[PDB]
């Protein structure tokens, strides 16, 4: 079942409706063996999910780079998982990028896209993604149905929330890996206080799974504040824009 995207506001809404218009089921290969996304993030200390993407809608200025070379650099630099943008119109990504990275590294991969149809989940798993992004701002109360579909497919999910209301939806759906986005996908405005605030609430509400802080991070001090609360942090643009990806990442790990 497809979510009603008629009322999704701003940029998020526009991106989502376009994706929904180009969704067309096609023959998929049998699912390959993939590592656990959740397990990699549960390793000691704040785990970094390094994100690869050729274009940044919020900050731009992403010079020419190769998703594979970036992924290899990230791995060597200490990333525990890699997020691959497969959204084509605003992030300049593609499913091919996911396939390529999958062939190059051993780290678990997250398909970063705007899932608006169950086929996108089947597709992600079929091509080697360990997990797929589920945005509560898009799926609404259908978040649980999509998460279950992922389970049936043997696919994990990074359930992304931005509000207290969305958090409750994610918690009731049984999310195991929960992400808090500091960025408002409708306006693209960033608020670094969002992750800590809602992360704390998640734990207080009994969430015992993997907590992931997302967006806007660029320096170690910001990460230090997440220790003891979050299990992981998703970082992309600040790395993609650095002179040397591996070096910038090593400094973030410390």
In angstroms, the CA 78 to CA 250 distance is 7
Instruction: Give the closest residue to 15 by CA, choosing from 91, 104, 95.
Output: 91
> Would you name the residues annotated as active-site residues?
51, 53, 112, 160, 181, 214-215
Burial class (CB in 10 A: 0-12, 13-18, 19+), 210: buried
Query: What is the CATH number for 210?
Result: 3.20.20.70
Per DSSP bridges, beta strands 47-52 and 131-135 are: unpaired
Instruction: Give the closest residue to 134 by CA, choosing from 167, 165, 158, 98.
Output: 158
Sequence-ordered strand ranges (E) for 6-95: 47-52, 81-85
Instruction: Give the closest residue to 161 by CA, choosing from 109, 215, 239, 110.
Output: 215
Instruction: Give the closest residue to 86 by CA, choosing from 71, 96, 76.
Output: 96
List, in order, residues 6 or more apart from 173 with CB less than 8 Å away: 143, 144, 147, 159
Structure tokens at 124: 């992600």
Instruction: Give the closest residue to 128 by CA, choosing from 51, 34, 30.
Output: 34
**DSSP one-letter code for 183:** B
**DSSP one-letter code for 32:** P
| Residue 204 belongs to domain spanning | 1-254
Domain count, the chain: 1
Instruction: Give the closest residue to 180 by CA, choosing from 196, 202, 166, 195.
Output: 195
State this model's resolution in angstroms. 1.8
Cβ atoms within 10 Å of 33's Cβ, excluding its own = 6
Q: What are the b/e assignments for 112-127, b being 16+ CB within 10 Å?
A: bbbbbbbbbbbbbbbb
């Amino acid at each position: 079942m497809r979510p009603d995207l008629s009322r999704v506001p701003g940029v998020l809404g526009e991106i989502a409706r376009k994706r929904a218009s180009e969704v067309a089921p096609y023959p998929l290969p049998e699912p390959p063996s993939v590592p656990s996304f959740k397990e990699a993030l549960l390793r000691p200390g704040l785990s970094v999910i390094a994100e690869v993407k050729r274009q940044s809608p919020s900050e731009g200025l992403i010079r020419e780079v190769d998703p594979v070379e970036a992924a290899l650099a990230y791995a060597r630099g200490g990333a525990r998982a890699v997020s691959v943008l497969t959204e084509p119109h605003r992030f300049g990504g593609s499913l091919l990028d996911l396939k390529r990275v999958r062939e190059a590294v051993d780290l678990p991969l997250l398909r970063k896209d705007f899932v608006v149809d169950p086929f996108m989940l089947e597709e992600a798993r079929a091509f080697g993604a360990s997990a797929a992004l589920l945005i509560v701002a898009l799926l609404g109360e259908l978040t649980g149905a999509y998460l279950e579909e992922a389970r049936r497919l043997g696919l994990e999910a990074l359930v992304e929330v931005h509000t207290e209301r969305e958090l409750e939806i994610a918690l009731e759906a049984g999310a195991e890996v929960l992400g808090i986005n500091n960025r408002d996908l409708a306006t693209l405005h960033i608020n670094l206080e969002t992750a800590p605030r809602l992360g704390r609430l998640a734990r207080k509400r009994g969430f015992g799974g993997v907590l992931v802080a997302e967006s806007g991070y660029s320096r170690k001090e910001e990460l230090k504040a997440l220790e003891g609360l979050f299990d992981a942090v998703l970082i992309g643009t600040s790395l993609m824009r650095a002179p040397d990806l591996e070096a910038a990442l090593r400094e973030l790990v410390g």
